[PDB]
Point group: D2
Chain length 299, copies 4
C-alpha cells in the first residue's frame, strides 16, 4: 500500500453538468474542473456516484474522462470511476482511463444482481488488469449498492494485487478504525461528508466527497486543524459543513450542489438527468444565499 | 385495465444466451424462443431481470428485442422490458419495442439512486409516451431494486394512463390480495415462481418467471388445476416446481436454467455475463438429470 | 410429529382483557373464553403475542393460564404460550401450564439480545424439560422478534425431542412449502391471518390468529372450502377477512379486536396495556358497525 | 431542563449484574464490582441497563440490584437507574423505587417488541418522568436492539419533554450525533457505542455510557482528557487499544467476556450471564485471562 501513498488527500467527487436537453454540457464541465483546481483541491474523482455515472452511456462517461484529463492532468490527482455492473464494460472504461493519463481507477462493488464474494474479487482483478498499471481504489457504498461486505472480505479486496486505496462510503467508524488497524499504509478515503472529522479521527487519511465541489477548502481546513490538534476549529468547520449538508439533503444533494454552482457562475443549467427532477423553486432563495455566503468565504 | 385484458396469462422471462466470448448468441436465442412457444407459453417477457438486462448495452438489448419479434410476433404475446435507471435510455428502448411490433412494454422501478415517488411516476409517464400506444407493465421487485413502494403508491402507478399490468415480484401475498381488491380488472403477474399457486389464490391472474423457460407447462397446469378446483394437483405441481427451484437457488438461478437448456440442446454455451461466474461443476449431474426428467415429462 | 396430530386446527390467539386501572379483568377473560367456545373454535393459544404476554408479570400470566384451563380444559384444545426472554422464567410458566392441564406449551424465539442458534436450541430443550410431557410449539415471528432463522435452523428446532408443531408467523410461503415438504406430519400453523388461504395452499394445516376471536368461523370456512375444491368460496372468505384486517391495522389490531368484542358485549373494557394507547375515537363508528355486521352474520 | 442536568455529564460504566451458577443474583460480587468501579475513578454508574441484563430479570431483582448499588455508592459517584421495561406501569414502579433509593436520575429504553406510535412513546416517557418524582430522565436510544427507529425530529421532541436532561445515544450515526448537539447545545449526550467513543465525542457527545468501562474505564477517561487538551494521537492510541479489546469481546460475547475478565481480576465470583446466554467457549478463556492480566498490569 506504500507505493500508492501519493493518492492520499481530499478529492472532489466531480459532478457531471448537463445542458437544457440533458446532453453533456462540456463548457460547464471544463469550468467546474477549473473551479475545483482554483479551490486548492488535491484531486478529482470523476464519473462516480456523484457524477451520475449510472444514467450515462459508456461513450458519455469516456467523453467526460477525456475532457477532465485535458483540463487537469498534471495539475491535480485524477481518479477515474470506471465501475459498471458489467465487468467487460468496467474494463472498457478502465482502458480509456489509462489512455487519457489518469492516476488511478475506481469501481463500485457491482450492484443489482447478487454476486458471491469470489465473483466480486474476480471483477476487481479483471478491471485492475485492464487499468494496466493504474492503481485501483475499491469503492464501498453499502447504502446504495446493497453489497454487505464483512471486514475479512474488505481485507481481502484491499490486498488484491494493484489495489492502492479504499473509498469507504460507510458511517460505521468502528469498521473504519478496524480497516486502518489491519492496513496501516492503506489510503483510506472518508466517503460521507457529514462525518468527515470523525472519520479522520477513526483512521481515514483523506476523503472523496460531493460537497467538496462547493466548499472543498473546509474539508482541507479540517485536515489541517486535526493535524495541529486544534479540535475546536475542526468541529466548527464540521458543523458548518453539516449546516450546508442539512440543506442539500432537503433539496436533493446533486441538484442542490449544481444549483449553488449555477449561482457561482460555473454551471449553466443545474439539472440532473431524469428521473431526477428539478430543484423545488421554494429552495432557490436558500441556495442563492449559500452561493453568496461561500463566494464571500472563498477558497 | 379491461382493455389490456389480452395480456393476461403465463409469460416466460426470457434468458439471454451468450457465446463463449460473452457476446449475444443469436442462434441459441432463436432456439429458446421457439422452445418456449412449443411449451404452450402464453408469451415472452424479454430483456428483463432474468434476461440480464443490466449487464447489456441498449444496442444489445435492442438486438434481442428485434430477433424475438422476428421469431414470435403474431404467435404469442411479446412484452419488452425497456427499463433502465435513466429515463431517456428507457424511452429509447420503448421506441424500439414499438418499432419491432411488441404487444407491451415494461419497466423496473429505476434503482441505485433514491428517487421520490413523483419522480417514479414521471419516469413511467415518459416511457409510456415513448411506447406510443403499447400498454405499460409496471415492474415491482423490491428485493433487488431497493424501492419500497406503499400500497397507495402502487395504486397510483398502476392507474396512470397507459398502464395495463403489474408484474409483482413480491412475496407479500396480503399486498397481492389488496391490489386485486382495489383493481378487479388489472392484469396481475405473480413474479416469484416458488409461490405461484399461492399468488394466484391471493389474486394474481397469471405470472412472469425465469423457471418457465424449462417447465412453463407446469405453471399452466397450476392455472388449469385451480380453475377446476383441483387443489391437490395444483399443490403437487407447485411442490415439483419448488424442488427444481431449491436446486436452481443452489446452482445460481439464471446459469442453472441456462445449463438445463444446454442439456436440452437449446443453449450452446450456458454462461451468464461477468461478474456472474460459471456453475460449480459439482452440480452438473443434477442439472443433467433434471434436463432428462423435463424432456421426458413434456 | 405424528403423535401431535391432535394439535391440528384453527386456534384463536386469545386476547388478555384488562380494566381501566390496567388490572386483569378476569370476568371478561372467562366471557371471552366462553365466546370462543360457543363460536366453535378448535382451541386457544393463551398468553401469546396477541395476549400481550410481554407487558405482564409471570404471576399475571399464570393467573390467566389457570382461569382458561378452568373454563375450557377438555372442551377445546389448549396451548400455553410460556415464552419469555429468560429461559428460567419460561420454565416456570411451562411447569405451571403442566400443573393446570394444558395440552401443549409454546415459546417465541427469545428476543432483544442476540443469541446463537445453539442458545435458542438449549432454550427450547430446557422449556420442554419443564413442560414435563406437554409437546412444544415452536413460535417463529421474525418481524417482531428480530430472530432470522434459516430453513435448516427451523428443521433442527422442529425435530427436537418433544416438539409437536410450529407456529409460523411469516409471510414467506416458499419457506412454508419447504417446511411442509421436509416434515410431512408436522402440525403447521399459519400465523398471518391476512394470507391464511394462501398459507394453507402452501402447506399449513391450520392456524393461530388474533382475528379468530371475532370471526374464527371464516377461517374454518376457508379450510373447508379448500378441502372441497371450492376455490371461489375460499377466496371470497379470505377477501372478507382482509377487509376487516385493513380496518384493524388502521385502528391498531389488538385494541381494535378488543373494541369489537366490547361492542359484542364480551369484553367490559377494550384497553390494551400501556404503552398501547386507546383506539382513536374517529374509528369507533367503523368498529361498532363491524361488531354489528359480525353479530348479524354469526347469529 | 437541559442546563439544569449539567451535573450528569461524564463517563459512566454500564454496570453488569453478577449471577451465580444457579442463575441467582450474586450480591457479594455486585458490591465488589461497584467498589471496583469507584476505585477506577469512574464518574458514575448506569444500573440495570441493557448491559446489566435488565430484560432477563424480574422487577424485584432489578430493585434489589438498584438498592444495593445505592447503598454502596450513593454520594460518591453519580447513579442512573435504568428503569425501562416494555410495560409503562412496570417502568414506573422501578422509577418510584430509584427515587426511594436516592438515585440521581432515571433512564428508559424505547419500549420494544410491540410497535408503538411516536405519541405512545412520548406518553410512556411522560408517565415514567412523573413517577421519578424529580429525578431527571435519560432517554435511551438503541435502534439496533430495540427496533425503534426515531427520526431526528422525533428525537428532538423526546429530549425536550419536561423532565428530560440527557440522551444515551447508542447509535453509530455520527451525523445524527452532530445534529443532536447542534439542536441542543446544553443537552447531556452520552456516546453509547464504546468502539467509536473518540469519534462520537468529536461529533458532539460530551461523555458516554458503556459496558467495557467496567474493565478499562480509565482509557475512556483518558480519551476525554486527550481531546480536551488537543492531543489527537493519544486519543487515537487509546481508542485503538479499546477496539483491540472490543474485537476480542465481540468474538467471545461481550457481557460474558467482560464478566470473565472481571472473574480473572478477582471481582466477580461466577462469570455467567443468564440463560439463554451460554457460557464463554472454553477455547477463548486463555485470551480472556491474558487480557485480565494485561489490564491489571496496566492499572497497577
Ligand atoms: Na382501478
Amino acid at each position: 500500500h506504500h507505493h500508492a501513498t501519493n493518492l492520499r488527500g481530499v478529492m472532489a467527487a466531480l459532478l457531471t453538468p448537463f445542458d437544457q436537453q440533458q446532453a453533456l454540457d462540456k463548457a460547464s464541465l471544463r469550468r467546474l474542473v477549473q473551479f475545483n483546481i482554483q479551490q486548492g483541491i488535491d484531486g478529482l474523482y470523476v464519473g462516480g456516484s456523484t457524477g451520475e455515472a449510472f444514467v450515462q452511456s459508456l461513450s458519455e462517461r469516456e467523453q467526460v474522462l477525456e475532457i477532465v484529463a485535458e483540463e487537469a492532468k498534471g495539475k491535480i490527482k485524477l481518479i477515474a470511476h470506471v465501475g459498471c455492473v458489467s465487468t467487460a464494460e468496467s474494463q472498457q472504461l478502465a482502458a480509456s482511463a489509462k489512455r487519457y493519463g489518469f492516476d488511478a481507477v475506481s469501481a463500485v462493488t457491482p450492484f443489482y444482481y447478487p454476486f458471491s464474494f469470489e465473483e466480486h474479487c474476480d471483477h476487481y482483478r479483471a478491471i485492475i488488469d485492464s487499468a494496466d498499471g493504474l492503481p485501483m481504489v475499491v469503492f464501498n457504498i453499502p447504502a446504495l449498492s446493497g453489497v454487505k461486505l464483512t471486514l475479512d472480505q474488505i481485507n481481502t479486496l484491499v490486498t488484491l494485487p494493484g489495489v492502492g486505496a479504499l473509498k469507504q462510503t460507510s458511517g460505521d467508524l468502528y469498521q473504519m478504525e478496524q480497516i486502518r488497524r489491519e492496513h496501516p499504509d492503506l489510503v483510506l478515503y472518508n466517503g460521507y461528508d457529514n462525518i468527515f472529522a470523525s472519520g479522520l479521527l477513526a483512521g481515514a487519511d483523506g476523503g472523496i466527497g460531493s460537497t467538496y465541489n462547493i466548499m472543498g477548502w473546509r474539508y482541507q481546513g479540517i485536515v489541517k486543524a486535526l493535524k495541529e490538534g486544534d479540535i475546536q476549529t475542526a468541529q466548527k468547520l464540521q458543523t458548518e459543513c453539516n449546516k450546508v449538508i442539512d440543506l442539500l439533503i432537503k433539496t436533493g444533494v446533486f441538484r442542490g450542489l449544481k444549483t449553488v454552482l449555477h449561482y457561482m457562475d460555473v454551471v449553466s443549467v443545474p439539472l440532473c438527468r431524469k428521473p431526477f427532477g428539478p430543484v423545488d423553486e421554494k429552495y432557490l432563495p436558500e441556495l442563492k444565499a449559500l452561493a453568496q455566503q461561500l463566494m464571500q468565504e472563498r477558497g
